[PDB]
């Protein structure tokens, strides 16, 4: 049975730990959002074929540029993430995350993931962005960024509502098979 | 309530970390040093490169740090002082991180399937690589938990800032020590 190492990267703002907790437990953690997600493995079935999916978090390493690549060797697929209501996190896909993933893992597939989909229509979120002359990231921007970095898919999801969430990890597995 | 949830996660993930390091030592390391089986010539007598100083890190958390953190369970606002008291012990994460690339290269180029076989033999969900990254993850995690405590402790919270300063200094020094 094939084993798959998937590493999740991106800014602190994206909600990496919450995303992984909500996917693996099938529920938004709600009350308290834990800071620790330990390396995880589960059997999951994709297209009628069993797969052992391994997931590594990277939260806490965002300011340590030489420690982060210690997690990268022998990765089968990367999720490069940004929050749909943080234009700064979207730009860091191009400025920060894609350059180091490609330099250390030039032949590994990438999925571009926009998180916090539920907030893109939120009035309070939109207004606070407007006060800084910004707006949320929309679907065609994600398409254009995915093309620029050679991502094999662009996907949007919400840890809160679980919209699009299982699809993210299904497609990560299909990128390897 | 929120500072109680943070303290509980700190303690529960510390027990999990001690357990994980204990399993790694008594499985992947024990097979090399036991003399029970067959060590390829590329890793023979090289346990010290593969595992670095993870024995000494385990000894610190198992003998000292978990027990002292438990004593702070009802004192979350003061737990920053635990990291101040024991700041010198955290210097061995600098040693560990420096050695990590040499460890990974040795395993890839010379261990073959030796450790994959041990893993299947014992039924472990975690590869040797999954265990050996945990000290790197843990030493960058403490600062997140201390940051969260600062969002919900009053201003008798100088006994969080000083501990946070230590736990930002340590992973920065480890980072700056990499080639």
Concatenating the DSSP letter of every residue in B5-27 gives HHHHHHHHHHHHHHHHHHHHIII
Residue B8 in contact with partner chain A when CB distance is under 8 A: no
Q: Which of A65, A63, A51, A130 is nearest to A101 (CA)?
A: A65
Name the method of structure determination.
Answer: X-ray
Q: Which residues of chain B from 91 to 120 reach within 8 Å of chain A, CB to CB?
A: 97, 100-101, 104, 108
CA distances in angstroms from B9 to A33, A34, A91, B63, B104, listed in the order given: 10, 7, 33, 20, 30
Cα gap B102→A103, rounded to integer Å = 19
Distance from CA of A90 to the nearest CA of B (A): 22
Q: Which residue has the tokens 């999990």?
A: B16
Cβ-nearest to A35 among B9, B129, B174: B9
E strand or H helix that includes residue A51: strand A50-56
Contact list in A for residue B141 (CB cut-off 8 A) is 35-36, 59-60
Nearest CA in chain A to B177: A66
Question: Which CB contacts under 8 angstroms, 24+ apart, belong to A42-46?
Answer: A43/A1, A44/A169, A44/A173, A46/A170, A46/A173, A46/A174, A46/A177
Cα gap B19→B26, rounded to integer Å = 11
Sequence positions preceding breaks in chain A, C–N over 2.5 Å: none
Tokens of A59: 């939260």
In this structure, whether the domain defined by A1-177 belongs to CATH 3.40.50.300 is answered with: yes
Cα gap A141→A139, rounded to integer Å = 6
Give the 3-state secondary structure of residue A115: strand
Cα gap A103→A152, rounded to integer Å = 18
The distance in angstroms from the start CA to the end CA of chain B is 43
Helices and strands: H and E segment counts in chain A: 6, 6
Instruction: Determine the structural domain holding residue B28 and report its residue range.
Output: 1-179
Cα gap B18→B106, rounded to integer Å = 25
Annotated binding site of A: 12-18, 31-32, 34-35, 59-60, 116, 118-119, 158-160
Angle at alpha carbon of residue B88, lines to B87 and B93, rounded to 5°: 90
Beta strand pairing call for A110-115 and A40-45:
unpaired
Give the count of domains, chain B.
1
Task: Assign residue B68 the CATH number of its domain.
Answer: 1.20.900.10
Ordered by start, the domain boundaries in chain A are 1-177
Tokens of A94: 């191009």
Distance from CA of B158 to the nearest CA of A (A): 22
What residues contact B49, with CB distance under 8 A and at least 6 apart?
A: B99, B102, B103, B106
Q: Which of B27, B88, B32, B33 is nearest to B56 (CA)?
A: B88
Strand partners, A55: A6, A40
């Amino acid at each position: 049975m094939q084993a798959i190492k998937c590493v999740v990267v991106g800014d602190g703002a994206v909600g990496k730990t919450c995303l992984l907790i909500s996917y693996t437990t099938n529920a938004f953690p709600g009350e308290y959002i834990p800071t620790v997600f330990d390396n995880y493995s589960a059997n999951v079935m994709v297209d009628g074929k069993p797969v052992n999916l391994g997931l590594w978090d990277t939260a806490g390493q965002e300011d340590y540029d030489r420690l982060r690549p210690l997690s990268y060797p022998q990765t089968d697929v990367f999720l490069i993430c940004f929050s749909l209501v943080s234009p700064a996190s979207f730009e860091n896909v191009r400025a920060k995350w894609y350059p180091e993933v490609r330099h250390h893992c030039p032949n590994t597939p990438i999925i571009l993931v926009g998180t916090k989909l539920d907030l893109r229509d939120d009035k309070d979120t939109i207004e606070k962005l407007k006060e800084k002359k910004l707006t949320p990231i929309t679907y065609p921007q994600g398409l254009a960024m995915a093309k620029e970095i050679g991502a094999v898919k662009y996907l949007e999801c919400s840890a809160l509502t679980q919209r699009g969430l299982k699809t993210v990890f299904d497609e990560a597995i299909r990128a390897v098979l | 309530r929120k500072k109680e949830f943070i303290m509980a996660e700190l303690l529960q993930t510390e027990k999990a970390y001690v357990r994980d390091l204990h399993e790694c030592l008594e499985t992947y390391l024990w097979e090399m040093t036991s003399g029970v089986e067959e060590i390829p010539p590329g890793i023979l007598n090289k346990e010290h490169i593969i595992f670095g100083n993870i024995q000494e890190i385990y000894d610190f958390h198992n003998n000292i740090f978990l027990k002292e953190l438990e004593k702070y369970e009802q004192l979350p606002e003061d737990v920053g002082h635990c990291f101040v008291t024991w700041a010198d012990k955290f210097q061995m994460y600098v040693t560990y991180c420096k050695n990590k690339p040499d460890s990974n290269q040795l395993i890839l180029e010379h261990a073959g399937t030796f450790f994959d076989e041990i893993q299947q033999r014992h039924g472990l969900a975690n590869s040797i690589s999954s265990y050996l990254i945990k000290p790197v993850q843990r030493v960058t995690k403490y600062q997140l938990l201390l940051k969260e405590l600062l969002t919900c402790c009053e201003e008798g919270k100088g006994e969080l800032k000083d501990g946070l300063e230590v736990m930002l200094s340590v992973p920065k020094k480890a980072n700056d020590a990499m080639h």
